[PDB]
Design a binder for these strands. Structure first.
Lengths: 110, 49, 110, 57
RNA sequence: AAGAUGGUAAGGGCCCACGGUGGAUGCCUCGGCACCCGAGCCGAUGAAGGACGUGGCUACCUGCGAUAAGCCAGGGGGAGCCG
RNA sequence: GUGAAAAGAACCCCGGGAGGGGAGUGAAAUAGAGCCUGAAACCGUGGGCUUACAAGCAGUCACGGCCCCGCAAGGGGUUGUG
RNA sequence: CGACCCGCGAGGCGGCUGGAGGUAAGGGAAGUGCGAAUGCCGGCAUGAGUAACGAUAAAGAGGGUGAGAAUCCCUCUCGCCGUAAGCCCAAGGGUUCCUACGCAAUGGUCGUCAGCGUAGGGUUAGGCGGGACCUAAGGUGAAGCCGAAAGGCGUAGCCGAAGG
């Protein structure tokens, strides 16, 4: 019950999966995978690991039924950045920040 | 456009070093002060072999 | 708990760990106070590689740590120990002049 | 040289972004099989429109 | 037929819960500070301070110098050790 | 700056590995390896009130409509018009 | 986190988290209370998912190894240099040149690839360049003169190289 799966410390950005994880709220799990195979936007590949981890958790360990599961309440949170330098034309140097992300999915029964 | 470093290796040793700091009566103050600054490990021996 | 310390071997009793019992002490260190008056069972894992056997497991790590092991036990276990009165041609006498004496002379019991 | 002024609010930072939401794709099933597919392409598991042309001979 | 006409939220607000990012406050310290006392020079029998080498396998500090994680004598110490 | 002690995660299950769900250690792993307590800015996911003919740094002072805590008396959040 | 006491700064009293220290009617001694100094160190937003990706010598297709490729390897067509974007020596750099593994981070994109990460291996001189041979500008310097001290000039001699 309440199958959980967390992909933690995966580096893209936390605003380039808010565009993707909103497509799989309220859907069923047979149709959240077909909507996510043919979608564009790299960032939709990392979300296609965590549902297929949560499905194996819900089947094997928590002892539910198989094909009655719908994806409830999936979300993504922040992560510790890391800084590098870019040199910028008459001296002055700049700082760019390459951010990470935490994707999590919980999974429930109808 | 020749921005003022332009390295050479005998000029490192014939102005900086040991035989150029232990000759002059004002340059021995440099060694006797860097040996008690807090022990600079050392700078001027950048030269090779 | 220094270069100055006590126990060689001997029927050492314990007081206060949930144990309240006692027998011989086996291998004493110094700078951590590591030995074995073997009571403590633990569960170390054994990594199951062919340099080891196929399925070994834990048990034999004890490490009774402190000075907590109260000392050699005659019929009066309540004892420290003073040093010699030496009563001979210059003994050195590391023996319990306190209550009673089963305290480590060269007999069958060490 | 054309630099801004007062920094924008949360309540109007997050009102431009209201209009960037993206659409799901369009899918129909392959009729020779039983799965999805974008509805004008060759199907990369069941084979064809009328005549194979793909898929592992 | 001329009705206060109203139940919708691409989105925005206020409040209440539950998580992430961040590193302040509390409790500690093998590290410092200021006054007191014991004491107060080493060196061509080659000094203060350094380069390079030395562990069965070794990167870095510490100890030692072709006898190189050491050798020979005297005392202490009384049990486990090969920084 | 983990724990009194490392007993610091054998072995199955998704994964190219990271990483996670179960077992197991422990008085407690929201004490797990940048790991004592762990605040504010900052960014999110669910529930309550409210709005697409209406003009204002903000709020405040009234009256009414829902939601909640109340045995009842009474109170807090929310804001439509003056 | 919260609807008991003082006019106020503030004290109590209850409810969750924490994990081993706190003191108290009456007195004493000062590093004693912060929104502002274009104040100082540390976090995090705004502009914004926009300007940019560093030369107008272009690319295309077929098979491979893999979990995964417009970008890594070979085969076949297409274009630019050709007095230089092609080979050979001195400076300067001083590790990684070559092989077998690998992808967390650096390559302003990807990457099974690399000048990137751990492990092993590799530069052989009587006859090539320089010392055990000379001297130039300059330097150092017995004797000799010197300058309140430090130190300054200087004869023979000696060091001094892409020159003999």
């Amino acid at each position: 019950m309440e199958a959980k799966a967390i992909a933690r410390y995966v580096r893209i950005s936390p605003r380039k999966v808010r565009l993707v994880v909103d497509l799989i709220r309220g859907k069923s799990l047979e149709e959240a995978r077909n909507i996510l195979r043919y979608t564009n936007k790299r960032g939709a590949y990392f979300v296609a690991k965590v549902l297929e981890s949560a499905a194996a958790n819900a089947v094997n360990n928590h002892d539910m039924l198989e094909d009655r599961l719908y994806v409830k309440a999936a979300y993504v949170d922040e992560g510790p950045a890391l800084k590098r330098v870019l040199p910028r034309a008459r001296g002055r140097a700049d700082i760019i920040k390459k951010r990470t992300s935490h994707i999590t999915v919980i999974l429930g029964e109808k | 456009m020749k921005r003022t470093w332009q390295p050479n290796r005998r000029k490192r040793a014939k102005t900086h070093g040991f035989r150029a700091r232990m000759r002059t009566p004002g340059g021995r103050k440099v060694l006797k002060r860097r040996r008690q600054k807090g022990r600079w490990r050392l700078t001027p021996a950048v030269r090779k072999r | 708990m220094r270069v100055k310390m006590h126990v060689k071997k001997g029927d050492t009793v314990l007081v206060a760990s949930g144990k309240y019992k006692g027998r011989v002490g086996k291998v004493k260190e110094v700078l951590p106070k590591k030995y074995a008056v073997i009571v403590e069972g633990v569960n170390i894992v054994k990594k199951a590689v062919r340099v080891s056997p196929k399925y070994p497991q834990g048990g034999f790590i004890e490490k009774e740590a402190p000075l907590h092991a109260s000392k050699v036990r005659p019929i009066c276990p309540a004892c420290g120990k003073p040093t010699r009165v030496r009563k001979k041609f210059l003994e050195n006498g590391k023996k319990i002049r306190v209550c009673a004496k089963c305290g480590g002379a060269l007999d069958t019991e060490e | 040289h054309p630099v801004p002024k007062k920094k924008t609010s949360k309540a109007r930072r997050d009102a431009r972004r209201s209009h960037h939401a993206l659409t799901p794709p369009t899918l129909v099933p392959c009729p020779e099989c039983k799965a999805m597919k974008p509805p004008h392409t060759v199907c990369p598991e069941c084979g064809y429109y009328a005549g194979r042309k793909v898929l592992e001979v």
